[PDB]
Design an enzyme around this catalytic site. Sequence first.
Site, PDB file in Angstrom:
ATOM      1  N   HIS A 214       0.822  -1.208   0.000  1.00 27.53           N
ATOM      2  CA  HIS A 214       0.000   0.000   0.000  1.00 27.53           C
ATOM      3  C   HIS A 214       0.859   1.263   0.000  1.00 27.53           C
ATOM      4  CE1 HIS A 214      -3.925   1.894   0.351  1.00 27.53           C
ATOM      5  NE2 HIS A 214      -3.312   2.814   1.074  1.00 27.53           N
ATOM      6  N   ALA A 215       0.650   2.115  -0.999  1.00 29.74           N
ATOM      7  CA  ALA A 215       1.417   3.351  -1.142  1.00 29.74           C
ATOM      8  C   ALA A 215       1.429   4.241   0.097  1.00 29.74           C
ATOM      9  CB  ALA A 215       0.898   4.148  -2.336  1.00 29.74           C
TER      10      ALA A 215
ATOM     11  N   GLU B  84      -3.619  15.175   2.313  1.00 28.73           N
ATOM     12  CA  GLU B  84      -4.059  14.258   1.266  1.00 28.73           C
ATOM     13  C   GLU B  84      -4.370  14.955  -0.060  1.00 28.73           C
ATOM     14  OE1 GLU B  84      -3.823  11.146   1.751  1.00 28.73           O
ATOM     15  OE2 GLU B  84      -3.396  11.364   3.894  1.00 28.73           O
TER      16      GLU B  84
ATOM     17  N   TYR C 212      -9.779  11.608   3.474  1.00 33.47           N
ATOM     18  CA  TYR C 212      -9.905  11.437   2.027  1.00 33.47           C
ATOM     19  C   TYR C 212     -11.174  12.088   1.482  1.00 33.47           C
ATOM     20  CZ  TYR C 212      -6.178   8.082   2.926  1.00 33.47           C
ATOM     21  OH  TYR C 212      -5.007   7.485   3.348  1.00 33.47           O
TER      22      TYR C 212
ATOM     23  N   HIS D  50      -6.945   0.523   5.264  1.00 33.24           N
ATOM     24  CA  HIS D  50      -7.033   1.461   6.378  1.00 33.24           C
ATOM     25  C   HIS D  50      -7.686   0.967   7.667  1.00 33.24           C
ATOM     26  CE1 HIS D  50      -6.344   3.460   2.609  1.00 33.24           C
ATOM     27  NE2 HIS D  50      -5.934   4.552   3.228  1.00 33.24           N
TER      28      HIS D  50
ATOM     29  N   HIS E  80       0.017  11.825  -5.803  1.00 35.76           N
ATOM     30  CA  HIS E  80      -0.602  11.904  -4.481  1.00 35.76           C
ATOM     31  C   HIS E  80       0.472  11.804  -3.406  1.00 35.76           C
ATOM     32  CE1 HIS E  80      -3.518  11.099  -1.227  1.00 35.76           C
ATOM     33  NE2 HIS E  80      -2.598  10.258  -0.790  1.00 35.76           N
ATOM     34  N   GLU E  81       1.303  10.768  -3.514  1.00 39.50           N
ATOM     35  CA  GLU E  81       2.376  10.528  -2.553  1.00 39.50           C
ATOM     36  C   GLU E  81       3.457  11.608  -2.598  1.00 39.50           C
ATOM     37  OE1 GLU E  81       2.195   8.243  -0.264  1.00 39.50           O
ATOM     38  OE2 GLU E  81       0.350   7.364  -1.055  1.00 39.50           O
TER      39      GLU E  81
ATOM     40  N   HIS F 266       2.604  14.412  -0.485  1.00 37.43           N
ATOM     41  CA  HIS F 266       2.910  14.252   0.939  1.00 37.43           C
ATOM     42  C   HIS F 266       4.364  14.650   1.177  1.00 37.43           C
ATOM     43  CE1 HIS F 266      -0.767  12.432   2.312  1.00 37.43           C
ATOM     44  NE2 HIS F 266      -0.635  11.334   1.589  1.00 37.43           N
TER      45      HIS F 266
HETATM   46  C1  LIG Z   1      -7.459   6.810  -1.613  1.00 37.05           C
HETATM   47  C2  LIG Z   1      -6.658   6.062  -0.557  1.00 37.05           C
HETATM   48  N1  LIG Z   1      -5.306   6.465  -1.015  1.00 37.05           N
HETATM   49  C3  LIG Z   1      -4.279   5.980  -0.270  1.00 37.05           C
HETATM   50  O1  LIG Z   1      -4.393   5.342   0.843  1.00 37.05           O
HETATM   51  O2  LIG Z   1      -3.147   6.266  -0.875  1.00 37.05           O
HETATM   52  C4  LIG Z   1      -7.147   4.592  -0.614  1.00 37.05           C
HETATM   53  O3  LIG Z   1      -6.242   3.795  -1.105  1.00 37.05           O
HETATM   54  O4  LIG Z   1      -8.210   3.954  -0.303  1.00 37.05           O
HETATM   55 ZN   LIG Z   2      -2.240  10.111   1.190  1.00 39.19          ZN
END
Ligand SMILES: C[C@H](NC(=O)O)C(=O)O
Ligand SMILES: [Zn+2]
Length: 574
Positions: free
Chosen positions: A314-315, A372, A480, A470, A344-345, A348
């Site tokens: 997971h990123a 985010e 998010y 998550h 996205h990353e 951050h």
């Molecule tokens: C949108 C969120 N992005 C993340 O965690 O990078 C997800 O994966 O459900």
């Molecule tokens: Zn993020």
Amino acid sequence: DEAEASKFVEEYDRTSQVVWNEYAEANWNYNTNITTETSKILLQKNMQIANHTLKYGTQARKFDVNQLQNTTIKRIIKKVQDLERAALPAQELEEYNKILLDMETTYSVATVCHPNGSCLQLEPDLTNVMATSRKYEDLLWAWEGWRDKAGRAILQFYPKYVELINQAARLNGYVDAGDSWRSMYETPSLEQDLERLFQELQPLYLNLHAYVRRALHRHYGAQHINLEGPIPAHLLGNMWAQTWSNIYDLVVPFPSAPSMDTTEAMLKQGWTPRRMFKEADDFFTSLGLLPVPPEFWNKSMLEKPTDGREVVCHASAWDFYNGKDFRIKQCTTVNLEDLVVAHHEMGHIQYFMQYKDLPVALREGANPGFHEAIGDVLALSVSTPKHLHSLNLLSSDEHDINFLMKMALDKIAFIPFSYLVDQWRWRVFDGSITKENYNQEWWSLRLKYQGLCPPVPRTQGDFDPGAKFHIPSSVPYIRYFVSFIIQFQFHEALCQAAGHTGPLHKCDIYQSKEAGQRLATAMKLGFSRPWPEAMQLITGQPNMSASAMLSYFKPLLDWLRTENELHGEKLGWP
Ligand SMILES: C[C@H](NC(=O)O)C(=O)O
Ligand SMILES: [Zn+2]
Ligand SMILES: *[C@@H]1O[C@H](CO)[C@@H](O)[C@H](O)[C@H]1NC(C)=O
Ligand SMILES: *[C@@H]1O[C@H](CO)[C@@H](O)[C@H](O)[C@H]1NC(C)=O
Ligand SMILES: *[C@@H]1O[C@H](CO)[C@@H](O)[C@H](O)[C@H]1NC(C)=O
Ligand SMILES: *[C@@H]1O[C@H](CO)[C@@H](O)[C@H](O)[C@H]1NC(C)=O
Ligand SMILES: *[C@@H]1O[C@H](CO)[C@@H](O)[C@H](O)[C@H]1NC(C)=O
Ligand SMILES: *[C@H]1O[C@H](CO)[C@@H](O)[C@H](O)[C@H]1NC(C)=O
Ligand SMILES: [Cl-]
Ligand SMILES: [Cl-]
């Protein structure tokens, strides 16, 4: 007393940098090399950082924040008085740390196997099946299988996790964990504000839902799609049906106007994960923003190891709290979806670099949503047909609608999902949902907000929430929902600052220094001021608002209403 306060903060800051840096190292080694050894070391580092938190947290509580004059000192100390998990008795703390580790490990190494012996991992195997298969039964196998292996496996840990995180929350002055998480926004009206935002996007989501439902009815048959009911959760091209862009082929508004195979293009011209992040880095610098340090390229894990090593795919973006070492860990796949995730990353990482000189206690986004949103804002410009064409990944009203539809399948479809996750957790945390009703309440929300139904009836023992990263990873999700709303507000403001005129969806802020300057000044504030100030700095006003997002999609909303109307669609699901 004010002198001891500024001295306390200075001491807290210099010692925190060292202890947090060490923890990040151990956490990184585990995340990028899951073994019994790295796990053991991580759990030991937990005790060390907790000991540091307890020491300074205890001292911090001895100060009467009400009497403190310096606002900055006041804010930091109030924050240090929250020991989080460190408030738990030693015994409960070790049990809590082990539970978190076990849930994370269980999720990240889970596989779904076939009778023969072919086992599939979530990334990229199952993800690919959910995105490309158009066979009801194959999609079902992957959808059910993932939940059977990951979800059910998390259920044995959740009740204890809830008890322990709630206990820690109460030991820090909150009523429960949900209360603690919501406090990150410093906004008493949060729940109401978010509900109003959700309601404003209802018309758009319901129209997109009805349109997509019709297309699925067209492809999978009337016997499998109720034109007046919810949509089977395994047919949206994504494991959680949180984003639907992967079934764009099934719902293209104007199929006459072909769209290049972006992924094929990327692969065709040898795009690599490194290239993807390099392009992201270029977009940030084009705005006058900061480039990632050379060290980033050397220490980051931008690809899934073939090392025969097990990792958390997971990123995620990492701040090692020394103002120099920042990294990204992502099992990047070469396609447009991951290109957006890469931005996205990188967003951050930009935030980390922008506030690296503030006291560590203030090294966070205005609120979690802001953190985010940064990357996504730039990704919005990158996604425009024209920009993609400039990267040689692409080659008109009808093209506008097709584009807006592709964007909506991700941004609009995600609204109810991102809203639902913590509505469920907040109720679990406050005791409204017991372990007896975990799954049933999850699906009642899945239906109520997303209008989805489980393709296979759930049974006792199922814990579908556990199949979403998550949840077992204990990472709050409302951030998010906030991000998707405000990122359009930022896009709108930045475009205006860049001198863009005409339809908002045609804007590309690439190379705009005026745009970059607004993001920079806002990011530099870190968590030093109430978020409305950062909102004002970027947009000229202080509130969250769905107006920008609605304005961005206006042409699509009108097209959808006309389309759904001529087909006599019944919006919603009675
Ligand atoms: C949108 C969120 N992005 C993340 O965690 O990078 C997800 O994966 O459900
Ligand atoms: Zn993020
Ligand atoms: C994975 O961690 C182990 C310790 O458990 C270490 O010996 C091994 O070298 C690490 N692998 C890599 C590729 O770093
Ligand atoms: C913190 O915990 C360690 C063990 O991890 C212990 O040796 C130490 O005395 C405790 N207190 C302080 C102030 O470090
Ligand atoms: C408050 O204290 C911080 C930390 O020492 C300092 O940087 C800041 O300038 C002080 N502010 C005022 C108004 O004195
Ligand atoms: C096992 O099933 C998979 C289905 O994913 C198939 O691709 C694979 O070829 C099968 N194995 C053998 C040996 O046939
Ligand atoms: C700004 O947000 C506040 C809440 O802080 C709300 O009362 C006010 O009406 C909003 N104003 C506008 C113009 O949206
Ligand atoms: C990272 O840079 C160092 C030089 O400091 C080099 O030796 C190393 O091979 C580089 N690693 C990668 C993956 O590029
Ligand atoms: Cl689910
Ligand atoms: Cl959050």
